[PDB]
Swiss-Prot record:
One of its GO terms (molecular function) is RNA binding. The lineage of its organism: Eukaryota, Metazoa, Chordata, Craniata, Vertebrata. It comes from the Eukaryota. InterPro entries: NIP7_N (IPR040598), Nip7_N_euk (IPR055359), PUA (IPR002478), PUA-like_sf (IPR015947), PUA_sf (IPR036974), Ribosomal_synth_fac_NIP7 (IPR016686), UPF0113_PUA (IPR005155). Residues 93-170 are annotated as: C-terminal domain. SUPFAM superfamilies: Pre-PUA domain, PUA domain-like. The keyword RNA-binding applies. Transmembrane segments: none annotated. The gene is NIP7. One of its GO terms (biological process) is ribosome assembly. This is 60S ribosome subunit biogenesis protein NIP7 homolog.
Amino acid sequence: MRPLTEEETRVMFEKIAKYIGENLQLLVDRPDGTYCFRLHNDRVYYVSEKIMKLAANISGDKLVSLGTCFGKFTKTHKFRLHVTALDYLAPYAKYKVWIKPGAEQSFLYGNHVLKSGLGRITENTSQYQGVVVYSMADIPLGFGVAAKSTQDCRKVDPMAIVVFHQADIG
């Protein structure tokens, strides 16, 4: 465990902002205390500061399980988001896509969503905007990238790609 570098923080902040804009502060400023990010084996962990204030008291290994991994830094120093972050980011992601049964199955196996499977998408979603993919029952399935804008999604043919697969649960 250890604080992130100023340069690492920016990268992660920039990546997370692609899905929740400037709402990360919502995850850091929790009504039950401040939360922070500690690096460990190149993976970023979301954990409360109270728990961090108890290092040297815990074997660290136990400390890693007390936090939630959000993703990790690649060798090309980029931040790869992990689906374990989904439950924390989803409630704060402005741009969402709701997909049908067929698309859901294909998404859970790692594929992209096709027009025929698009049930609904948040208004004014730009092309390449980072989105959170939900099932028709409104449950989080993963992170995606809009292939076309919400406007262009209507005009496209059923076999066209409307959401690229980033990460999925399951």
